[PDB]
Design a protein around this motif. Structure first.
Motif, PDB file in Angstrom:
ATOM      1  N   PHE A   3      22.292   8.235   8.553  1.00 33.15           N
ATOM      2  CA  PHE A   3      22.969   8.302   7.284  1.00 33.15           C
ATOM      3  C   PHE A   3      21.980   8.737   6.230  1.00 33.15           C
ATOM      4  O   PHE A   3      20.814   8.418   6.338  1.00 33.15           O
ATOM      5  CB  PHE A   3      23.564   6.929   6.942  1.00 33.15           C
ATOM      6  N   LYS A   4      22.465   9.397   5.220  1.00 29.85           N
ATOM      7  CA  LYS A   4      21.651   9.923   4.125  1.00 29.85           C
ATOM      8  C   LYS A   4      22.110   9.385   2.792  1.00 29.85           C
ATOM      9  O   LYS A   4      23.275   9.106   2.582  1.00 29.85           O
ATOM     10  CB  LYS A   4      21.763  11.429   4.136  1.00 29.85           C
ATOM     11  N   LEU A   5      21.129   9.227   1.913  1.00 28.29           N
ATOM     12  CA  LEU A   5      21.334   8.906   0.535  1.00 28.29           C
ATOM     13  C   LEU A   5      20.740   9.983  -0.350  1.00 28.29           C
ATOM     14  O   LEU A   5      19.551  10.232  -0.305  1.00 28.29           O
ATOM     15  CB  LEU A   5      20.712   7.553   0.141  1.00 28.29           C
ATOM     16  N   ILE A   6      21.556  10.590  -1.190  1.00 22.72           N
ATOM     17  CA  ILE A   6      21.133  11.487  -2.242  1.00 22.72           C
ATOM     18  C   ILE A   6      20.950  10.678  -3.517  1.00 22.72           C
ATOM     19  O   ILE A   6      21.890  10.040  -3.972  1.00 22.72           O
ATOM     20  CB  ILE A   6      22.096  12.661  -2.481  1.00 22.72           C
ATOM     21  N   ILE A   7      19.759  10.753  -4.112  1.00 20.88           N
ATOM     22  CA  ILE A   7      19.408  10.013  -5.338  1.00 20.88           C
ATOM     23  C   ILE A   7      19.361  11.012  -6.433  1.00 20.88           C
ATOM     24  O   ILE A   7      18.543  11.918  -6.435  1.00 20.88           O
ATOM     25  CB  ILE A   7      18.077   9.301  -5.176  1.00 20.88           C
ATOM     26  N   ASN A   8      20.251  10.816  -7.355  1.00 21.21           N
ATOM     27  CA  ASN A   8      20.201  11.627  -8.580  1.00 21.21           C
ATOM     28  C   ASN A   8      19.917  10.620  -9.722  1.00 21.21           C
ATOM     29  O   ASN A   8      20.827  10.229 -10.435  1.00 21.21           O
ATOM     30  CB  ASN A   8      21.510  12.348  -8.795  1.00 21.21           C
ATOM     31  N   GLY A   9      18.656  10.184  -9.881  1.00 19.43           N
ATOM     32  CA  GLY A   9      18.261   9.140 -10.843  1.00 19.43           C
ATOM     33  C   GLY A   9      17.582   9.721 -12.070  1.00 19.43           C
ATOM     34  O   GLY A   9      17.310  10.918 -12.167  1.00 19.43           O
ATOM     35  N   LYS A  10      17.312   8.823 -13.013  1.00 22.08           N
ATOM     36  CA  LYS A  10      16.650   9.181 -14.258  1.00 22.08           C
ATOM     37  C   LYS A  10      15.164   9.505 -14.048  1.00 22.08           C
ATOM     38  O   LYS A  10      14.648  10.407 -14.728  1.00 22.08           O
ATOM     39  CB  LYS A  10      16.803   8.032 -15.271  1.00 22.08           C
ATOM     40  N   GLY A  38      14.891  -0.230  -8.423  1.00 23.25           N
ATOM     41  CA  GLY A  38      15.455  -0.264  -9.765  1.00 23.25           C
ATOM     42  C   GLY A  38      16.453   0.829 -10.138  1.00 23.25           C
ATOM     43  O   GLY A  38      16.606   1.177 -11.340  1.00 23.25           O
ATOM     44  N   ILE A  39      17.152   1.361  -9.119  1.00 25.77           N
ATOM     45  CA  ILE A  39      18.123   2.407  -9.288  1.00 25.77           C
ATOM     46  C   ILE A  39      19.457   1.718  -9.480  1.00 25.77           C
ATOM     47  O   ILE A  39      19.839   0.887  -8.636  1.00 25.77           O
ATOM     48  CB  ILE A  39      18.171   3.332  -8.018  1.00 25.77           C
ATOM     49  N   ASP A  40      20.160   2.052 -10.558  1.00 27.53           N
ATOM     50  CA  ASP A  40      21.526   1.552 -10.854  1.00 27.53           C
ATOM     51  C   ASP A  40      22.409   2.748 -11.225  1.00 27.53           C
ATOM     52  O   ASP A  40      22.112   3.436 -12.208  1.00 27.53           O
ATOM     53  CB  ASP A  40      21.583   0.630 -12.070  1.00 27.53           C
ATOM     54  N   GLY A  41      23.484   2.993 -10.508  1.00 27.25           N
ATOM     55  CA  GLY A  41      24.339   4.110 -10.850  1.00 27.25           C
ATOM     56  C   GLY A  41      25.659   4.052 -10.148  1.00 27.25           C
ATOM     57  O   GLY A  41      26.000   2.980  -9.646  1.00 27.25           O
ATOM     58  N   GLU A  42      26.357   5.177 -10.149  1.00 29.69           N
ATOM     59  CA  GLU A  42      27.666   5.294  -9.511  1.00 29.69           C
ATOM     60  C   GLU A  42      27.500   5.822  -8.096  1.00 29.69           C
ATOM     61  O   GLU A  42      26.736   6.817  -7.893  1.00 29.69           O
ATOM     62  CB  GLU A  42      28.597   6.220 -10.291  1.00 29.69           C
ATOM     63  N   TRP A  43      28.187   5.176  -7.169  1.00 31.55           N
ATOM     64  CA  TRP A  43      28.075   5.471  -5.740  1.00 31.55           C
ATOM     65  C   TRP A  43      29.311   6.201  -5.205  1.00 31.55           C
ATOM     66  O   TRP A  43      30.445   5.782  -5.493  1.00 31.55           O
ATOM     67  CB  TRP A  43      27.945   4.148  -4.977  1.00 31.55           C
ATOM     68  N   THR A  49      29.817  14.088   6.222  1.00 30.70           N
ATOM     69  CA  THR A  49      28.400  14.366   6.289  1.00 30.70           C
ATOM     70  C   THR A  49      27.565  13.096   6.368  1.00 30.70           C
ATOM     71  O   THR A  49      26.329  13.159   6.377  1.00 30.70           O
ATOM     72  CB  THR A  49      28.017  15.140   5.033  1.00 30.70           C
ATOM     73  N   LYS A  50      28.199  11.922   6.432  1.00 30.29           N
ATOM     74  CA  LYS A  50      27.507  10.643   6.593  1.00 30.29           C
ATOM     75  C   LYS A  50      26.486  10.486   5.419  1.00 30.29           C
ATOM     76  O   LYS A  50      25.380  10.019   5.639  1.00 30.29           O
ATOM     77  CB  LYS A  50      26.867  10.447   7.952  1.00 30.29           C
ATOM     78  N   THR A  51      26.919  10.888   4.212  1.00 31.62           N
ATOM     79  CA  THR A  51      26.032  10.983   3.033  1.00 31.62           C
ATOM     80  C   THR A  51      26.562  10.230   1.845  1.00 31.62           C
ATOM     81  O   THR A  51      27.670  10.520   1.368  1.00 31.62           O
ATOM     82  CB  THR A  51      25.756  12.481   2.690  1.00 31.62           C
ATOM     83  N   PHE A  52      25.755   9.299   1.333  1.00 29.26           N
ATOM     84  CA  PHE A  52      25.988   8.621   0.077  1.00 29.26           C
ATOM     85  C   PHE A  52      25.297   9.354  -1.027  1.00 29.26           C
ATOM     86  O   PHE A  52      24.264   9.982  -0.797  1.00 29.26           O
ATOM     87  CB  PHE A  52      25.414   7.178   0.138  1.00 29.26           C
ATOM     88  N   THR A  53      25.821   9.220  -2.252  1.00 31.70           N
ATOM     89  CA  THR A  53      25.141   9.684  -3.466  1.00 31.70           C
ATOM     90  C   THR A  53      25.140   8.542  -4.484  1.00 31.70           C
ATOM     91  O   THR A  53      26.160   7.874  -4.664  1.00 31.70           O
ATOM     92  CB  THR A  53      25.828  10.888  -4.048  1.00 31.70           C
ATOM     93  N   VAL A  54      24.004   8.285  -5.096  1.00 36.56           N
ATOM     94  CA  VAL A  54      23.895   7.403  -6.219  1.00 36.56           C
ATOM     95  C   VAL A  54      23.439   8.245  -7.405  1.00 36.56           C
ATOM     96  O   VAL A  54      22.451   8.965  -7.326  1.00 36.56           O
ATOM     97  CB  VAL A  54      23.063   6.184  -5.965  1.00 36.56           C
ATOM     98  N   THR A  55      24.196   8.153  -8.504  1.00 39.06           N
ATOM     99  CA  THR A  55      23.982   9.022  -9.679  1.00 39.06           C
ATOM    100  C   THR A  55      23.815   8.090 -10.866  1.00 39.06           C
ATOM    101  O   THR A  55      24.728   7.305 -11.206  1.00 39.06           O
ATOM    102  CB  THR A  55      25.133   9.940  -9.871  1.00 39.06           C
ATOM    103  N   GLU A  56      22.636   8.160 -11.475  1.00 40.55           N
ATOM    104  CA  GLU A  56      22.269   7.271 -12.573  1.00 40.55           C
ATOM    105  C   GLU A  56      22.800   7.883 -13.834  1.00 40.55           C
ATOM    106  O   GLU A  56      23.066   9.078 -13.943  1.00 40.55           O
ATOM    107  CB  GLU A  56      20.764   7.047 -12.753  1.00 40.55           C
TER     108      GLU A  56
END
Length: 56
Positions: A3-10, A38-43, A49-56
């Motif tokens: 599984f993958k996580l895409i981090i779109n953070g500050k 310390g990442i907080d955002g929308e998931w 694609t078995k892919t999460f995204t977290v967007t800060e």
């Protein structure tokens, strides 16, 4: 499965991968990862694609 996580953070951006049996377990692990950084955002999660995204 991988599984993958895409981090779109500050401050951090990127992508990480880990092994989990299913999407619920991967979500837990990625949310624990996000807390460690310390990442907080929308998931969102893309099952194809078995892919999460977290967007800060």
């Amino acid at each position: 499965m991988q599984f993958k996580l895409i981090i779109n953070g500050k401050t951090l951006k990127g992508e990480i991968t880990l092994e989990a049996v299913d999407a619920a377990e991967a979500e837990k692990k990625f949310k624990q990862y996000a807390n460690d950084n310390g990442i907080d955002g929308e998931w969102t999660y893309d099952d194809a694609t078995k892919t999460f995204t977290v967007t800060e």
